[PDB]
Design a protein around this ligand. Structure first.
Ligand SMILES: CCCCCCCCCCCCCCCCCC(=O)OC[C@H](COP(=O)([O-])OCC(O)COP(=O)([O-])OC[C@@H](COC(=O)CCCCCCCCCCCCCCCCC)OC(=O)CCCCCCCCCCCCCCCCC)OC(=O)CCCCCCCCCCCCCCCCC
Ligand SMILES: CCCCCCCCCCCCCCCCCC(=O)OC[C@H](COP(=O)([O-])OCC(O)COP(=O)([O-])OC[C@@H](COC(=O)CCCCCCCCCCCCCCCCC)OC(=O)CCCCCCCCCCCCCCCCC)OC(=O)CCCCCCCCCCCCCCCCC
Ligand code: 07D
Ligand SMILES: CCc1c(C)c2cc3nc(cc4[nH]c(c(CCC(=O)OC/C=C(\C)CC/C=C(\C)CC/C=C(\C)CCC=C(C)C)c4C)c4c5nc(cc1[nH]2)C(C)=C5C(=O)[C@@H]4C(=O)OC)C(C)=C3C(C)=O
Ligand SMILES: CCCCCC/C=C\CCCCCCCCCC(=O)O[C@H](COC(=O)CCCCCCCCCCCCCCC)COP(=O)(O)OC[C@@H](O)CO
Ligand SMILES: CCCCCCCCCCCCCCCC(=O)OC[C@H](COP(=O)(O)OCCN)OC(=O)CCCCCCCCCCCCCCC
Ligand SMILES: COC(C)(C)C\C=C/C(C)=C/C=C/C(C)=C/C=C/C(C)=C/C=C\C=C(C)\C=C\C=C(C)\C=C\C=C(C)\C=C\CC(C)(C)OC
Ligand SMILES: CCCCCCCCCCCCO[C@@H]1O[C@H](CO)[C@@H](O[C@H]2O[C@H](CO)[C@@H](O)[C@H](O)[C@H]2O)[C@H](O)[C@H]1O
Ligand SMILES: CCCCCCCCCCCCO[C@@H]1O[C@H](CO)[C@@H](O[C@H]2O[C@H](CO)[C@@H](O)[C@H](O)[C@H]2O)[C@H](O)[C@H]1O
Ligand SMILES: CCCCCCCCCCCCO[C@@H]1O[C@H](CO)[C@@H](O[C@H]2O[C@H](CO)[C@@H](O)[C@H](O)[C@H]2O)[C@H](O)[C@H]1O
Ligand SMILES: CCCCCCCCCCCCO[C@@H]1O[C@H](CO)[C@@H](O[C@H]2O[C@H](CO)[C@@H](O)[C@H](O)[C@H]2O)[C@H](O)[C@H]1O
Ligand SMILES: [Fe+3]
Lengths: 47, 304, 45, 275, 256, 47, 45, 47, 45, 47, 47, 45, 44, 47, 47
């Protein structure tokens, strides 16, 4: 699977991967913040 | 004192066009010439390309338009006189809340749903047509994505927000005055749509698009005596028209664009005008029930 | 594209599609074990 | 501090007023006499706006507002505490806008280009003047101008729009909205066409004017032309502003009633007035 | 409540701040595209590469994008090809902000509004690889449309009314169907021929007779219009030179 | 009175006359339909 | 256009006028037999 | 009354005439449909 | 274009007229037998 | 009649005729669907 | 009949026919879905 | 495009005409068996 | 070309049949789960 | 029916077919979800 | 089946399929979060 970089530029692919992962992580974090159970800033009760 | 606002002397030659592969369909339209259009711009008309995606889009769009018009005429009991009287007030209303996202009865919003589906399909097929026409001429697809922004706003208004609310009841009708009344009632139901910040952003970008396309139009018309109207050629080989266009704005404003990058600004202001608008529409009702109370909470209003 | 590299791409693309489908199938089986998504005649519960 | 081609057009002359006194540059900016005057008016107007913010209760940038005098003062000059500050800021803004346009005129003369840009800016200045001077004078009070505030001038827009109970039904407003939307659409199309011609893809040599004409001949059925598009765009924006000015002069100075029921005239033309 | 994320922060505010971040990035991108011509900046007097610029300099100038031509040619943007510091003018004051006194006849010295970009000596190309700006003699197919005054043989006069010359030929752009130039034979020198841009003309079809008038330069200024080589195909540099010369009239049309 | 036909060619003159007369006939018929007395279709009584 | 061809076209066009107008007249006769469209002095009754 | 065709070319004349006749017929049918007396689809007692 | 090359076109066209009008009249006859579309003095009841 | 088709190109004539007939048929079906008596999708009653 | 393809390009004829049939079939299915009788998914009772 | 190119296309085209019409007719017969779409005098049963 | 059309059709038909077989299996399973043709009394 | 590819281009036909099949699948799935009986994600009781 | 990559470039096919799969996965996940039974963040009772 090392030939993928013969198709995709390592610099461009790595930058795009980094940005995509950052946006995905940020969105997942904000989604967890929105929920009552997994918001770690208010800290609501499980019950 | 000439201004290049109107073309006093016109030129007419044998119509010609860039070469495309023949494809299933040929170019259609037997090109002709017009005088007022040649006074304001080019004089040649057509030919229009009608490919498979073009036929598909035209058929879907014509079906939607015929459905809408038939319903409008039927609402006034097929009276041409009373159709003339109420034409602006006529509208194909969306189905009520109780029907959800499923098929309503034809009289109760089924025709609205069918027309909206056909219109959405024709608009998306027209987007595909713009993409394919740009690619066929060995050009870029900037027009397709600029159109995709507008389609995003359109689908947010008509389909996406109904999906989020699970309800077509608050979608926009197919009418002249009814869709303005939808705009008014949508703003009223959700608290002073001025207090929607993405509405403020969209208005900022609409104002900026008008401002930019007056600035750029006046700049190109001001350097049109220097070959400044030939923008792509000044992009590939910078002439003194582009230099003076840049220096005018650099001296009056502190900064300037390129003949190429000014159209990037033009593209992005127009695209953002509808992107922020679609976001603001998708946010109302779902996340923000009342935009005035959101503005009060966030410091936009003096907190009555 | 060249047929020689087309064969290699098809082989390892087929392997990769098998991997993706297998992982997705494992995920679906886990979700089904957790909560099935095909209701019975009387709803779910 | 100069572009690669800037130290070739930085000649003197082209100034309407001031001779060689202010014919110079500061950084990238050209100053001239009218740059000095636009600094004079901008500094004073901004200082007065900040002073009205200090007199205000917020310092919240979006809740800072400069209100015009109450309509009970009519067209009279108002005390600075209550209404007069808005009037002075209005006059300073008008002076600064005029100085800006005139400085643009001097720059156009210096570069030997057309005066299209200051002429186009004149329409924005006219729209502002119609909103703060012409319409309040016709209506008979300075309190019909809009407050100088981020969100409060939107409150003014909403209040005046609903004063005629639906301001969409203003036909000149419909036409101005149509022109603004068409200007945005035309700007999108023009920027997109230029970018696509200049950036056609991998390989894909730069396309000429014939390719740009062919694109919209194929997709729409007509192509305006690389020169006529800037014409129609400038005319579209200026006409949108003109029809907005018309719709605001029509509301209050001329028409003082419900715009929605203005359209009953249409309902009762003799060839369908079924009654 | 319904739409909040953490107490005071809600979804709409988060999406707004995401837009603000995206718009800051977009402004950076657009400014990078703007800085593709005339950059980097030079000193106003000496011309060394200097400017009051911060940590954004590394991001200010973009890598040169490559434009491909339909001739094998290529343009680089930005190409760091700059103008010479020494122009045919002198600083009024040595303060880096002062304007320039021309040190000669600025019409023919290409100083100020007469200045023209140092382009390349190739005519604009059509879709068929031929010159676009051509005289109507060598384009038999092209013709002037009816319902418009034909600007052939009409006297060419300035604002003062003096008949500068007579128009014999029209030069037109093949790529965009419109008149670009009028070929004018001098009433003072038959052996001299000049090109006058069509954008600099008034039709003047509504008067006692039909004539072509120019409001920029005077009749005598037609004796120093820049010349062209091929007389049937004009390069970009030559046309830019001629247009710059004609546009220089308005500033100093009556001496300096 | 025949001298009209060397300024107005009969093609354009007659097509314009046809369009004008047809539009006027539509106008008059519609105006009558809007009045109760002369609406021959609804047929409201004279009294 | 040659006057003979115009004469032949006029003849066939007059034949079409005859058939079309006869069809329309029969249609109007049938409609009047069904329901007249000239109300009496006291209206439709 | 045959000399008309010397001016009006039969091709476009027939197309325009057919379109006009169809539009007129459609207009009359719609007007008849609107009226409560002549609507043959809904059906209503004359008496 | 050529008269000889279009007379057979007219034969096909008139055959299509015949078949299409026959199907249309058959459909109209069935619709009439199902529900007539000419109301009488009392309407349809 | 073996000389009347020299007035229109049969391709465009057939395409226009087909489009026009389809539009008219669709319109007639729509009008029937609007009327209660002839709306065959719903179970309206004659009496 | 056999020469119908000597006036119409078979590719264009097939594409137009397929487009029209697809759109018409979609419309018919949508209309039946918008009924109390022929919506096979809602499955309302006949009586 | 020729008299020969048209023959095979017409053969296959009419084969498809018959196949499509037969499939549609069978589907319509099935739907009519399920729920008829021509109402009686008193409406649908 | 038209020579490659034979092999293209040979593989295209096999893809058509396999896709249709998967779709038909899905439809049969769904029909077992919940048939979509209601009876005279609606659904029950 | 092997000559269907002698008219149209395999690559464009394949991309069009894939796009159309995916869009139709999405439409049918969305319609099924919008119905109460066949929404497999919401609790769907037959009675 | 290896010949399909004759028609389609591996690189564009890879990027298009990657974006399609990610968008479809996001859409399905958002749908599941929209359903009460399958929202794993709110964790509503099966009862
Ligand atoms: C919000 C909703 C959406 C709404 C849409 C619109 C939103 C607003 C944003 C978009 C619209 C505006 C977009 C422009 C943003 C960027 C502007 C910009 O970069 O201008 C740089 C421009 C200078 O251009 P530059 O090439 O970056 O010059 C910097 C050189 O390195 C060195 O330059 P120098 O040494 O020649 O400068 C000397 C100069 C000092 O220069 C300055 O004061 C500017 C300093 C920053 C540059 O001298 C003096 O003025 C004293 O200076 C200005 O910003 C002028 C003010 C314009 C904003 C008011
Ligand atoms: C830092 C933090 C903030 C970030 C700020 C980023 C600023 C934006 C940068 C930018 O505008 O670059 C324009 C740049 C202009 O391209 P160009 O130089 O005209 O292309 C020359 C080629 O020879 C000719 O190229 P072509 O015409 O073949 O390229 C077509 C290409 C796109 O190229 C274009 O047609 C023009 C640009 C369209 C918008 C692309 C930017 C989207 C926003 C940034 C990401 O098509 C696409 O890749 C799809 C892009 C649009 C997808 C929108 C779908 C919805 C996304 C949002 C929900 O376009 C792109 O960067 C494409 C980005 C593709 C990934 C999009 C991911 C979403
Ligand atoms: C009482 C009303 C209330 C009041 C407070 C107020 C006032 C003002 N507003 Mg607002 N507005 C209110 C409500 C409100 N407002 C908007 C929108 C905007 C945006 C539209 C941008 C655009 O181009 O749209 C327009 C673009 C669209 C709709 C998207 C593209 C459309 C397409 C591709 C259609 C293709 C069509 C065919 C192919 C043709 C065939 C089809 C058929 C025959 C059927 C723009 C910025 C804008 C401007 C201002 C100003 C200047 C003011 C001033 C001065 O007061 N308003 C929309 C939006 O984006 O909101 C976030 C929206 O949905 C919505 C609502 C509900
Ligand atoms: C940046 C945001 C910007 C905003 C401010 C903005 C707003 C509005 N943009 C609006 C309308 C359209 N926009 C468009 C096109 C789509 C056509 C279509 O869908 O046809 C598909 C539909 C249909 C087929 C349905 C009917 C059909 C009719 C009336 C003909 C029926 C009869 C027939 C077929 C028979 C006779 C003829 C024969 C040949 C046999 C229309 C004209 C397009 C683009 N907007 C862009 C952007 C913007 N649009 C860009 C970049 C574009 C394109 O690329 C594309 C285009 O073609 O532009 C030339 C509206 C109503 C707006 C408002 C204000 O509400
Ligand atoms: C100019 C045209 C602007 C049109 C859109 C304006 C939208 C602003 C609406 C708004 O007000 O959005 C708020 C602020 O966003 C913010 O400032 C974000 C920062 C705003 C930057 C503006 C940049 C303009 C360029 C949401 O953020 P909060 O955490 O509640 O802030 C609270 C404090 O600021 C005030 O008590
Ligand atoms: C194209 C034609 C089909 C378009 C519709 C596709 C399915 C939409 C979700 C169906 C649904 O299940 O949405 C129903 C629910 C609401 O359900 P409810 O709680 O109101 O249920 C009441 C009883 N039904 O929407 C949601 O909450 C989730 C919304 C998710 C995001 C919506 C926007 C999606 C835009 C289309 C993206 C397509 C990308 C495809 C991949 C490239
Ligand atoms: C050619 O025409 C002749 C006959 C002359 C005349 C014909 C017609 C006429 C006169 C038409 C006039 C039309 C008018 C006045 C139209 C006005 C239209 C306006 C202003 C519309 C404005 C906005 C409407 C919008 C944005 C609606 C958007 C709706 C959408 C996007 C809905 C999509 C719905 C979908 C996809 C539904 C999905 C649900 C189901 C399950 C049903 O999908 C299958
Ligand atoms: C199903 C619900 C309703 C939605 C409608 C779904 C069907 C309509 C959209 C299908 C997808 C269309 O996608 C597009 O199809 C057409 C063929 O039709 C193909 O395009 C084809 O026509 C173009 C027209 O310019 C020609 O150059 C050429 O004949 C061929 O490329 C495209 O390669 C494909 O991208
Ligand atoms: C490869 C990755 C993607 C995989 C996607 C494929 C998923 C396929 C899921 C459906 C497969 C069929 O799954 C089968 O459905 C039937 C209904 O017909 C269910 O039906 C059975 O269980 C339910 C549970 O409440 C009972 O109410 C019902 O009486 C009983 O018949 C079975 O529990 C299930 O085993
Ligand atoms: C091939 C592709 C195109 C398919 C086209 C199909 C067209 C089908 C047209 C069907 C017409 C059927 O015509 C119809 O026949 C049935 C008997 O069978 C009659 O029966 C009808 O009325 C009776 C009397 O109440 C009812 O009991 C019955 O349920 C109802 O169907 C109708 O009075 C008659 O109008
Ligand atoms: C590519 C995919 C192709 C899909 C093809 C689908 C073909 C559909 C086959 C229909 C078979 C009919 O099968 C028969 O239909 C009748 C209605 O007429 C239904 O009738 C039955 O179910 C209904 C509703 O559940 C109830 O009132 C009762 O249980 C019974 O009457 C049953 O489903 C079955 O007895
Ligand atoms: Fe431009």
């Amino acid at each position: 699977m090392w030939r993928i970089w013969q198709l995709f530029d390592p610099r461009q692919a790595l930058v795009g991967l980094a940005t995509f992962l950052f946006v995905l992580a940020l969105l997942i974090h904000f989604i967890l913040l929105s929920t009552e159970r997994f918001n770690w800033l208010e800290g609501a009760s499980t019950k | 004192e000439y201004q290049n606002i109107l073309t006093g002397v016109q030129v007419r030659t044998a119509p010609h066009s860039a070469p495309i592969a023949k494809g299933i369909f040929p170019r259609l339209g037997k090109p002709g010439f017009s005088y007022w259009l040649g006074k304001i711009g080019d004089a040649q008309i057509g030919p229009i390309y009608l490919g498979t995606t073009g036929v598909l889009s035209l058929v879907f769009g014509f079906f939607a338009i015929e459905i809408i018009g038939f319903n409008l005429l039927a609402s006034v009991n097929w009276s041409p006189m009373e159709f003339g009287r109420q034409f602006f007030w006529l509208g194909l209303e969306p189905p009520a809340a109780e029907y959800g996202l499923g098929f309503a009865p034809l009289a109760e919003g089924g025709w609205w749903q069918i027309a909206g589906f056909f219109l959405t399909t024709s608009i998306l097929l027209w987007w595909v047509r713009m993409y394919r026409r740009a690619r066929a001429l060995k050009m870029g697809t900037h027009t397709a994505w600029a159109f995709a922004s507008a389609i995003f706003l359109f689908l947010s208004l008509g389909f996406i927000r109904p999906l989020l609310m699970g309800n077509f009841s608050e979608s926009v009708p197919f009418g002249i005055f009814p869709h303005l009344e939808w705009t008014n009632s949508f703003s009223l139901n959700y608290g002073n749509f001025f207090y929607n910040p993405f509405h403020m952003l969209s208005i900022a970008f609409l104002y900026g698009s008008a401002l930019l396309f007056a600035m750029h139009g006046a700049t190109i018309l001001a350097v049109s005596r220097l070959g400044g109207d030939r923008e792509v050629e000044q992009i590939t080989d910078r002439g003194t028209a582009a230099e003076r266009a840049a220096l005018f704005w650099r001296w009056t404003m502190g900064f300037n664009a390129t003949m190429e990058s000014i159209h990037r600004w033009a593209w992005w202001f127009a695209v953002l005008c509808t992107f922020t608008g679609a976001i603001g529409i998708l946010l109302t009702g779902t996340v923000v029930d009342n935009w005035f109370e959101w503005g009060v909470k966030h410091g936009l209003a003096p907190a009555p | 594209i060249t047929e020689g590299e087309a064969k290699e791409f098809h082989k390892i693309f087929t392997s990769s599609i098998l991997v993706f489908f297998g992982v997705a199938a494992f995920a679906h089986l886990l979700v089904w074990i957790w909560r099935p998504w095909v209701p019975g005649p009387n709803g779910y519960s | 501090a100069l572009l690669s081609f800037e130290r070739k057009y930085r000649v003197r002359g082209g100034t309407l007023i001031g001779g060689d006194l202010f014919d110079f540059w500061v950084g990238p900016f050209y100053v001239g006499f009218f740059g000095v005057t636009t600094l004079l008016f901008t500094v004073l107007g901004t200082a007065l706006i900040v002073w009205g913010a200090a007199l205000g209760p917020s310092w919240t940038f979006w809740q800072i507002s400069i209100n015009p005098p109450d309509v009970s003062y009519g067209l009279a000059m108002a005390p600075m505490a209550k209404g007069g500050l808005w009037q002075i800021i209005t006059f300073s803004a008008i002076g600064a806008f005029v100085s800006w346009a005139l400085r643009e005129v001097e720059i156009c003369r210096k570069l030997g280009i057309g005066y299209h840009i200051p002429f186009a800016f004149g329409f924005a200045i006219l729209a502002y003047v119609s909103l703060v001077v012409i319409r309040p004078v016709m209506m008979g009070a300075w309190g019909y101008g809009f407050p100088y505030g981020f969100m409060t001038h939107l409150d003014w827009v909403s209040n005046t729009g609903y004063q005629y109970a639906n301001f969409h039904y203003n036909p000149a407003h419909m036409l101005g909205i149509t022109l603004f939307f068409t200007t945005c659409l035309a700007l999108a199309l023009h920027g997109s066409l230029i970018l696509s011609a200049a950036n056609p893809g991998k390989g894909e040599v730069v396309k000429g004017p014939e390719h740009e004409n062919t694109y919209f001949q194929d997709t729409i059925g007509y192509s305006v032309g690389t020169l006529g598009i800037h014409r129609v765009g400038l005319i579209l924006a200026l006409s949108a502003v003109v029809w907005s000015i018309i719709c605001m002069i029509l509301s209050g100075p001329i028409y003082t009633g419900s715009w929605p029921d203005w359209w009953l005239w249409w309902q009762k033309l003799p060839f369908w007035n079924h009654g | 409540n319904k739409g909040d994320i953490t107490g005071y922060m809600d979804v709409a505010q988060v999406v707004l701040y995401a837009f603000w971040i995206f718009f800051a990035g977009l402004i950076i991108y657009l400014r990078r595209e703007d800085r593709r011509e005339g950059y980097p900046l030079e000193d106003a007097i000496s011309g060394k590469i200097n400017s009051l610029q911060g940590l954004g300099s590394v991001f200010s100038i973009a890598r040169p994008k490559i434009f491909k031509l339909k001739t094998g040619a290529t343009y680089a943007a930005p190409n760091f090809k700059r103008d010479a510091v020494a122009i045919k003018a002198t600083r009024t004051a040595p303060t880096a902000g002062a304007p320039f006194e021309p040190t000669g006849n600025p019409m023919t010295d290409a100083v100020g509004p007469a200045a023209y970009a140092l382009r390349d000596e190739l005519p604009d190309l059509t879709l068929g690889g031929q010159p676009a700006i051509v005289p109507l003699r060598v384009a038999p197919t092209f013709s002037v449309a009816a319902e418009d005054t034909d600007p052939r043989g009409l006297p060419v006069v300035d604002r003062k009314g003096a008949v500068a010359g007579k128009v014999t030929d029209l030069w037109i752009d093949r790529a965009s169907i419109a008149i670009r130039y009028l070929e004018v034979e001098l009433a003072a020198t038959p052996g001299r021929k000049v090109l006058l841009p069509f954008a600099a003309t008034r039709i003047n079809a509504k008067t006692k007779s039909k004539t072509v008038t120019v409001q920029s330069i005077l009749a005598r200024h037609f004796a120093n219009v820049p010349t062209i080589a091929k007389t049937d195909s004009i390069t970009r540099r030559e046309e830019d030179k001629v247009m710059a010369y004609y546009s220089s009239g308005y500033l100093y049309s009556d001496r300096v």
